């Protein structure tokens, strides 16, 4: 949930394959923004009674509470779309099943996870763990001609001009942040953190619970930062500065690994296959975490209760439709379904202000709340400024 996310891969890799090491700042500043924003939700959940979804509901009337629910629920679907595309592409590379058919299979991948269920819930992740590590080892190995400072000269050391000027870099920049700061994790983390061991009503030493939770929230977020940098490096190394200007999608990475000279042919074919299985593996883990988050949002805003398997079906059904419509319109174009993938993360950018602002208001009222709301207010205004600028410059 940060490195096994196809939304993270496609944005970072095309962010390097098209614009070099420029967007490395955006990775850093968003990963840092994620650390801080997640810590606020952690506090919000442990301090106040319950999570962000119901907290937002307590301040809004039902009409505007549904509008907030709509925006939030769409962000959950947008993430699911990312998995649908990711799994469809994976099935196309491995089994040769066309994207239009693969997307249809994703409705019943839910059913496939129960086939994995009775084979060890620990047994399989160990294979996936080695799978991810092996694939990541390939990616690390696939980094040559690496200038030890040309990274730095744009990594963190911000070239803040093109990042906001032309739509191209700005578009990917929004996708990168939206994929690293996922709006549905704010609602999820603000409730799952209340499962830790501490006295609910009276004891304030639950700051210890916040202590552990924030440290854990910064650990995995650091790894996500490393991977995103590792993946942007990968795309830049392989596809950036080319005469043909490859966008650098999953298909490009597949044939880059499969046709890498030093990597051989038969050996290179294994690497590409392992990547495809890892891409498939990136899906089924994401849908479980996304389903629990959907429960919180719906029960928080609408105060409506339906079983997870049902909402897992409804959310998936709604996610496959725009994927299929996209495949029908552009006649199954693989580069076009990857644009929908990137766009799904750019939408997460649009939905963020509707989640960050309520998080802000709660964090400035009831005890144990933060000293400088300064670092958090400049984030929202600069955020809505950009998503509207892009939202207007395109339109």
């Amino acid at each position, epitope marked *: 949930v940060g490195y096994m996310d196809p939304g993270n891969w496609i944005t970072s890799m095309q962010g390097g394959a098209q614009y070099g090491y420029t967007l490395l700042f955006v990775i850093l500043i968003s990963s840092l923004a994620a650390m801080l924003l997640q810590s606020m939700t952690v506090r919000l959940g442990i301090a106040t009674g319950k999570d962000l979804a119901q907290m937002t509901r307590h301040f809004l009337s039902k009409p505007v509470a549904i509008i907030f629910w709509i925006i939030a629920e769409l962000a959950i679907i947008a993430t699911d779309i990312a998995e649908v595309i990711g799994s469809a592409i994976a099935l*196309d*590379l491995i089994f*040769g099943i066309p994207l239009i058919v693969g997307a249809l299979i994703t409705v019943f991948d839910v059913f496939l996870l129960l086939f994995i269920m009775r084979f060890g819930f620990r047994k399989i992740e160990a294979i996936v763990g080695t799978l991810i590590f092996t694939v990541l080892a390939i990616f690390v190995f696939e980094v040559f001609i690496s200038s030890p400072q040309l990274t730095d000269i744009l990594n963190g050391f911000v070239p803040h001009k093109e990042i906001v000027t032309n739509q191209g870099i700005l578009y990917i920049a929004l996708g990168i942040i939206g994929a690293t700061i996922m709006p549905h994790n704010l609602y999820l983390h603000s409730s799952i953190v209340q499962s830790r061991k501490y006295d609910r009503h009276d004891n304030e030493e639950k700051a210890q619970a916040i202590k552990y939770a924030t440290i854990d929230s910064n650990l995995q977020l650091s790894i996500a930062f490393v991977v995103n940098c590792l993946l942007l490096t990968l795309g830049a190394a*392989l*596809f950036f500065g*080319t*005469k*043909t200007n*490859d966008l650098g999608g999953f*298909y*490009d990475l*597949y*044939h*880059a690994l*499969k*046709t*890498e*000279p030093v990597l051989g*042919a038969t050996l*290179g*074919g294994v690497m590409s296959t392992l990547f495809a299985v890892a891409l498939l593996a990136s899906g089924q883990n994401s849908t479980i975490t996304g389903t629990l988050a959907g429960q919180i949002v719906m029960e928080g805003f609408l105060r409506l209760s339906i079983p997870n398997w049902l909402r897992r079906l409804i959310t998936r059904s709604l996610a496959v439709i725009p994927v299929i419509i996209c495949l029908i319109i*552009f*006649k*199954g*174009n*693989s*580069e*076009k379904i990857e644009q929908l993938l990137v766009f799904s993360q750019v939408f997460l950018s649009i939905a963020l202000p509707f989640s960050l602002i309520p998080l802000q208001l709660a964090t400035s009222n009831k005890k144990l709340m933060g000293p400088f709301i300064n670092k958090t207010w400049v984030n929202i205004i600069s955020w809505t400024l950009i998503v509207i600028l892009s939202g207007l410059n395109v339109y």
Partner: nanobody
Amino acid sequence: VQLQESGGGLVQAGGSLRLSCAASRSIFSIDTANWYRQPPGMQRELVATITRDGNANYADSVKGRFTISRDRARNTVYLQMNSLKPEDTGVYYCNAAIRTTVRTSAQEYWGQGTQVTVSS
């Protein structure tokens, strides 16, 4: 690296066929592809053309019936031939711009044609 063709053969008018254009070894990308044909006693004719961005165009004699497409996963260019007429009979060739690796310059490749016979 050689361009290999398949999927042809014998079929009745009204039937359909699907030609396959792949390379002998692993390729990074087929940037451009052309499907030529040559009926008995006639000239070599361009039938289908697919571009890098995916757009395609067909001869007026074959448009609406033929469909060229790229399988990015397997780097294969297909020619879906539907509602075949007896005059579609001939030898079909595959011209394609193969890119061996990512940064390798795009070379032009041809291939030994395959026989397509629409009978009766």
